[PDB]
Structures are given as structure tokens and as C-alpha cells.
Design a protein around this ligand. Structure first.
Ligand SMILES: Nc1ncnc2c1ncn2[C@@H]1O[C@H](COP(=O)(O)OP(=O)(O)O)[C@@H](O)[C@H]1O
Ligand code: VO4
Ligand SMILES: [Mg+2]
Length: 754
């Protein structure tokens, strides 16, 4: 028979032949497993490409456009170490989990410069170049949105884009060294090992590269969002604090180790609940001194990763600081605060006749106060009392200590981002190309406010993609009278409203709890379920598909049905985590440090959730004002391994990211377009009298023919002319404004009229 695609539980789809049809279902015979059959629904079976070994660079070029052929085409490419594949002018990128030779080389960079989409193989570099060309030609700033769940490859692709644009369109080694070599610094302070990603970003960023009128790089600017705070003090056993702690412990000279009073990570509360092992290989393990290694490292050996290496990354980070222009004083200032936070965490309290510092904590107190430029008694007092003085219980002292740790580290991070921005400043610019790299969709056995905020942000980003690519695109077709078949899809605005709505949204209900005389997580949680009974996007934990979640009580958690999947959150500590305010007692202490660096870090209730919403909406305003390009990163498996394509997991991402819906729309859609009037007028200037007499519509048809299009490749709308997928190269030639180019084509067409 003719082979079709039919469901498979782990592969997503499998190859088979239809061997019966009935009023209720079909009967499929899996290829090669003849005699065996299974039933499938008619609506679940798809036509397959005749050649199962070939692949296409643009999925729109498939004979059959559907989720099954999309999946297979990406799979074949992935098997040949081609991680990049288009859907029209959108890029899908599947994490290879290893370094594929040469594909990011300076030679490869040069080969993408000025090349139209489709004239070179799919690549993150082509997306970057197209953003650059639109900026230069349309005179419009550009955003490149890199989406995907945790570990899918957003950060690595963001970095490829930045390297490409700076190496291609920035003059000198300097501006490259500055924008690119700034990255090891941000990652040291803002990235950490989670169970999904050894190099997980725990903050979001929008990095703008700014250009002058001549489209040459003049500088950069990084905006950062919502560093994860809880991580600073505690991690789960398979996770780590921010990389900087481990890089410093493994890599610092003896002189620096002594001065900062560092030791192996098992020695610090703020590291020792987490994995205390270093990333290292056989060689680099030899370069780490024995006195830096925890008992767990000594027993279990190092963590393995093809990229991360704590000792090697320390050295690389130090080299980075030098290259961008941090002096040694600035470096040591950074390290001193990092150490101060570590010693801060080692301070213990015991019930007094209030509470006191345990006798064993005297040293930690001395080291902390020293490193942060504080008087020991002031510090002791601020941790054990509050304001008329009031003595604190041990639990309260623990919280005060940790709150100070979190605020100090967070201000340190703010300084790092600012200092990076000061490495590539600019007074003015004409346009920018910005790249968005957020912390991606994630969930674990236990999900808290951190995951809730991250997933909320991912929800908002996916809504932007929907708004731009699925909603506005179709409204454009409609407005222009193209008669493109409407593609319906599940929108996630209702999910956003559940979280965001004034007064009754989850964030506002949380704020309300914070402002109550006796704030309670259980009270907040009940109010949410109460106000949103029968909301499609909200469930009580016992309804979870996973046994681990069902034991959670109704007022102890909730399930949000995110666009990317249901996530069950434990709501314990939501109220605490929602308050960004720091006690003035603690603030003044740090503000009045004897140390200038410490003071400069710092220049009842503040809603973390609503501060975040506000910052994200400002970001979204900026995105809306730009031309937007999209790279959809895909995580191939849950094991961080190479050449292990989990078809069902990948299909699920293709569906929820909207790529299946976009592929559908591209069956009759038109990804390129331009104003007819403007297009005609551009050529009109050069037209001999006979050609200028020619009907403008007829001229355009002749132009398109001359530049290689068939009538099915384009379509005139009311005011714009539209072009099909796969025709970007011809579109670009048609739109080319170079006076020499214009003249030649005008000559050619006017010749037909003799
Ligand atoms: N194109 C790529 N080439 C090589 N390794 C990659 C690529 N993309 C991702 N990786 C690997 O996968 C890991 C996670 O990718 P990353 O971009 O950090 O994920 P996220 O989407 O969470 O930012 C990286 O640390 C690196 O090991
Ligand atoms: O693991 V990532 O947070 O950087 O999406
Ligand atoms: Mg990342």
C-alpha cells in the first residue's frame, strides 16, 4: 500500500499501511512487522512523504504539511547533525547536546553575511542576518525571540546570534571582545545547575546591539529580569547555587582562598544542601587542589558536562573580565562580596533567656563583617533584633540572615549587569537588534513560586508569538482580501488572565494576602480556588496525573494548565516569596558599610509578582515596537544526551509552541510582502516613456516573472503584494533598492515592449 503515519506512544508516529477502514476506525499494519495490526482514528493518521530518507530545509516544501511529516523531517535532519530547520522564516532548533564541528566557525559566519533566507542552509546565523537586513532596509529596530523549555538551547543560540552580529557588523576586536566576552561574567553570577540544565539561566535577559546610521555596531545594552533569589541560600541535592561560588572555590589561588577564608563547598550552609561537586574532567580535576574538594566529590567523582568545568570556567571568567576591561581591584571586590555572603550563611542562632549567635558562629560573623565592611556588633544586632528594639526567635534570625544574603547577592548581580553595560556604552544609536533569552518553561517533583513566575513569563512569551504569527498574520490576510483559509488554534490568553487579571488574578489575590493582618498561604490558596472554581486553567492538586502531587491538600497547592503542560505548584511560601521588601534595619546596615564598593551596591511590602508583571509588560511594549523573528528551541530528551531523539517529547513541543499551527497556516500563507505603490514607485523613476505608459500591475507581473516567480508564487492584495514560502530570495531581489539594480530590470522589461 501507500505508507502513512499513525500514532506511536514513544515515537509520536510510526510508519504503517492502512489495511482496513470501518465506520468507526482504521486498521494499521506497522511497516516490517507484517501480520500485526493496530487500530487508529481517521483523524489521527497522516500521509507520509514518499521518500523517507530525504529531508527538506524548509518544512513548507514538504509534499504533505502536517505534524507527522514535520516531526519526521526534523528527525532525519537531526540524525545527520542538522539541528536547524525552517518553517518559512521561523527557525526550529533541536539541541544536539554535543559540539558539532565548524558550524559556528568564523568561516561559516562569513558565508551567511548578506545571504537571503533559503540561499544558505537553515541556521541561527541566517535569522540574525535577516534581522540585520530588515533593520538596515526597513529602518526599524528588530527583536529575535529565542523560545523553548529549560535546557532546549535558548542561551547557546542567543550567544551564536550575538557572536554572529558583532563579528559580522562590528569593526575591531574590541567591540567583539566586549559584547561576547561579557557572557562568562553574567553566567557566573546568574546561571546554576538544575536537574534540567547544568547551565540553567536563573534570570531573563534582553540584549540589544545598537547600530549607527551606517549600520555598524556602536555598543550594547543588557536588560535583566527576576534573578532567582531562593537559590542564593538553599538548593535541592541534585542542584547547585550560582556557578560563581564553585568557580571561586575550585579556581581561586591559595592567596585568594586564604584572604576570603574559603574552603570546600561542604563547609557552607549556602552550598551544602545542594550538590557540592565540581564539573571537571580527568585533566581539570588534577588542577583543583585537594583542599577544595568536598567528601561527596572525593567519593563520587566530578560532575560531567561537555561545556561546564568549574576550574576552567574560573580561568575563562577571569580572562573575560580582563578582556572587557575590569581591573584586578574590581575582580577582587566581586569575590569579596561572594565570600561575604557565604560566611553570612554560616552564622547560627540559639534560643536565649530572644536569641543569640551560637558560640561556634563567632568566626563566620567575623569573616562576614570583615568582607562586607561591617562592624561585627551591628551585624549581630541586625540579625537578632528588629524595630524600640524587639528580640527575634531563632527562626526569625535565620530569615533575617537569609534575607540579607539574598539582597546583597541580588544587588551584586545588578552591579555586574550594570558593569557589563559600562563596557560597551554608546551615546546614541539609530536602531538596535535585541535578543530575548528568558529562563524557560520548567517543572520538577516540587514546584514553587520560582517555577510559577518562570512559567508565567513563558506563557506571556508564547502569547506574543500567537499574537504576532497566528492572530495578526491572519488579520492581515483578511484585511487585504487574500482569502487564506483560517487556522484555528488554542490560545492561552485565558491562562494569562487567570494569573494577571486585576483584583481576581492570582498575583493580585497573593498581594491581598500579603496585606492581610495575618497572611496565610492556605488562605491565599483557598481564595484562588474559590474565585476560580470551574476555570479551565486551574485545578486542585489531587486531580494531578502524577501520584506524587495527589497527596497535596486543596489549600496547599494548585495546578495551572499552562500552554506547555499542567504544572502542580505547592503554595507553601508563596506569600513570603511574594514580598521583595527588605527591613530598613538590614538596609541601613549595608548602606553604611565602611567599604565604598559595598555602599555603591545599594545606591513593608513590595509585590514580586506585580513588579515582574510590570517589567514584562514594558518588555512586551518594546517587542511590539520592533520587527520580530523567532527561533523555537527544542529539547530532544530528558537525559542531556546526544543522538537520542524522543519523538513523543519533541512532537509535544512542536504542538504547544504553535509550530504545527504555523505549518498549517503556511499551506496557503504568504510570509513576505510589500506595498505595491511603494514597490512600483521605486522602479518608476527609471522607466522609459513607453514603460511608464504600461499599466503598473502589468509591470509588476513582468518584473516578478523576470526575477523568477510563477503566478502561483505571489498574490496582489488590496494594498500589498504577498509572496509564498520558499521565495525569499526572489522577494529580496524584487525589493532591492540599489539604483544600478533598479535600472537593469527596468531596461530588461522595457525591452520586451519594443
Ligand atoms: N547548538 C548547540 N551546540 C552544542 N551544545 C548545545 C547547543 N544548544 C544547547 N547545547 C547544550 O545544551 C545545554 C543547555 O542549553 P542552554 O542554551 O543552556 O539551554 P536553555 O534553553 O535552558 O538556555 C548547553 O549547556 C550545552 O551543553
Ligand atoms: O535551563 V534555561 O532556564 O536557562 O530555560
Ligand atoms: Mg538559558
Amino acid at each position: 500500500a501507500k505508507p502513512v503515519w499513525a500514532p506511536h506512544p514513544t515515537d509520536g508516529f510510526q510508519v504503517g499501511n492502512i489495511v482496513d477502514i470501518g465506520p468507526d476506525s482504521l486498521t494499521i499494519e506497522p511497516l516490517n512487522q507484517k501480520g500485526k495490526t493496530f487500530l487508529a482514528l481517521i483523524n489521527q493518521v497522516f500521509p507520509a512523504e514518499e521518500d523517507s530518507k530525504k529531508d527538506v530545509e524548509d518544512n513548507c516544501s514538504l509534499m504533505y504539511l502536517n505534524e507527522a511529516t514535520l516531526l519526521h523531517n526534523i528527525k532525519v535532519r537531526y540524525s545527520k547533525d542538522r539541528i536547524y530547520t525552517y518553517v518559512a522564516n521561523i527557525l526550529i532548533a533541536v539541541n544536539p547536546y554535543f559540539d558539532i564541528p565548524k558550524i559556528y566557525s568564523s568561516e561559516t559566519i562569513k558565508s551567511y553575511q548578506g545571504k537571503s533566507l533559503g540561499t544558505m542552509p537553515p541556521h541561527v546565523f541566517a535569522i540574525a542576518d535577516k534581522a540585520f537586513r530588515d533593520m538596515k532596509v526597513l529602518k526599524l529596530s528588530q527583536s529575535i525571540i529565542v523560545s523553548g523549555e529549560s535546557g532546549a538551547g535558548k542561551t547557546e543560540n542567543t550567544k551564536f546570534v550575538l557572536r554572529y552580529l558583532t563579528e559580522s557588523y562590528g569593526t575591531g576586536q574590541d567591540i567583539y571582545d566586549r559584547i561576547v566576552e561579557a557572557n562568562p561574567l553574567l553566567e557566573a553570577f546568574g546561571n546554576a545547575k538544575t536537574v534540567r540544565n547544568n547551565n540553567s539561566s536563573r534570570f531573563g535577559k534582553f540584549v540589544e546591539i545598537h547600530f549607527n546610521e551606517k549600520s555598524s555596531v556602536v555598543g550594547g545594552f543588557v536588560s535583566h529580569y527576576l534573578l532567582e533569589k531562593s537559590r542564593i541560600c538553599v538548593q535541592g541535592k541534585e542542584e547547585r547555587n550560582y556557578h560563581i561560588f564553585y568557580r571561586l572555590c575550585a579556581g581561586a589561588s591559595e592567596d585568594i582562598r586564604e584572604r576570603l577564608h574559603l574552603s570546600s563547598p561542604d563547609n557552607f550552609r549556602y552550598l551544602n544542601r545542594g550538590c557540592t561537586r565540581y564539573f571537571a574532567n580527568k585533566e581539570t580535576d588534577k588542577q583543583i587542589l585537594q583542599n577544595r574538594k568536598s567528601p561527596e566529590y572525593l567519593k563520587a567523582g566530578s560532575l560531567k558536562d561537555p561545556l561546564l568545568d568549574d576550574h576552567g570556567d574560573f580561568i575563562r571568567m577571569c580572562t573575560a573580565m580582563k578582556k572587557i576591561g575590569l581591573d584586578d581591584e574590581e575582580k577582587l571586590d566581586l569575590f569579596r562580596v561572594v565570600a561575604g555572603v557565604l560566611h553570612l550563611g554560616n552564622i547560627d542562632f540559639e534560643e536565649a533567656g530572644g536569641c543569640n549567635l551560637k558560640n561556634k558562629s563567632t568566626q563566620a560573623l567575623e569573616y562576614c563583617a570583615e568582607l562586607l565592611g561591617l562592624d561585627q556588633d551591628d551585624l549581630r544586632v541586625s540579625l537578632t533584633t528588629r524595630v524600640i528594639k524587639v528580640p527575634l526567635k531563632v527562626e526569625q534570625a535565620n530569615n533575617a540572615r537569609d534575607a540579607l544574603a539574598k539582597t546583597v547577592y541580588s544587588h551584586l548581580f545588578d552591579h555586574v549587569v550594570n558593569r557589563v553595560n559600562q563596557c560597551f556604552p554608546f551615546e546614541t544609536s539609530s536602531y538596535f537588534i535585541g535578543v530575548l533569552d528568558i529562563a524557560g518553561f520548567e517543572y520538577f517533583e516540587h514546584n514553587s513560586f520560582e517555577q510559577f513566575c518562570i512559567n508565567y513569563c513563558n506563557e506571556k512569551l508564547q502569547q506574543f508569538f500567537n499574537e504576532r504569527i497566528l492572530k495578526e498574520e491572519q488579520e492581515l490576510y483578511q484585511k487585504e482580501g487574500l482569502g487564506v483559509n483560517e487556522v484555528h488554534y488554542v490560545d492561552n490568553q485565558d491562562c494569562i488572565d487567570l494569573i494577571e487579571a486585576r483584583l481576581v488574578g492570582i498575583l493580585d489575590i497573593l498581594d491581598e494576602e500579603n496585606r492581610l493582618p495575618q497572611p496565610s498561604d492556605q488562605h491565599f490558596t483557598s481564595a484562588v480556588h474559590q474565585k476560580h472554581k470551574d476555570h479551565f486553567r486551574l485545578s486542585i492538586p489531587r486531580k494531578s496525573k502524577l501520584a506524587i502531587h495527589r497527596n497535596i491538600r486543596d489549600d496547599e497547592g494548585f495546578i495551572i494548565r499552562h500552554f506547555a503542560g499542567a504544572v502542580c505548584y505547592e503554595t507553601t511560601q508563596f506569600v513570603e516569596k511574594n514580598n521583595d521588601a527588605l527591613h530598613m534595619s538590614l538596609e541601613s546596615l549595608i548602606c553604611e558599610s565602611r567599604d565604598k564598593f559595598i555602599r555603591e551596591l545599594f545606591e513593608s511590602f513590595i509585590s514580586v509578582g506585580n513588579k515582574f508583571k510590570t517589567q514584562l509588560n514594558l518588555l512586551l511594549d518594546k517587542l511590539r515596537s520592533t520587527g520580530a523573528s523567532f527561533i523555537r528551541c527544542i529539547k530532544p530528551n530528558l537525559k542531556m544526551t546526544s543522538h537520542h531523539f524522543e519523538g513523543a517529547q519533541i512532537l509535544s513541543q512542536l504542538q504547544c509552541s504553535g509550530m504545527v499551527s504555523v505549518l498549517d497556516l503556511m499551506q496557503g500563507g504568504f510570509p513576505s510582502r510589500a506595498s505595491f505603490h511603494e514597490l512600483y514607485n521605486m522602479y518608476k523613476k527609471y522607466m522609459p516613456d513607453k514603460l511608464a505608459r504600461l499599466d503598473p500591475r502589468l509591470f509588476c507581473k513582468a518584473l516578478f516573472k523576470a526575477l523568477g516567480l510563477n503566478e502561483i508564487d505571489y498574490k496582489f492584495g488590496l494594498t500589498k503584494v504577498f509572496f509564498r514560502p520558499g521565495k525569499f530570495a526572489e522577494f529580496d531581489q524584487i525589493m532591492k533598492s540599489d539604483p544600478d539594480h533598479l535600472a537593469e530590470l527596468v531596461k530588461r522589461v522595457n525591452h520586451w515592449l519594443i
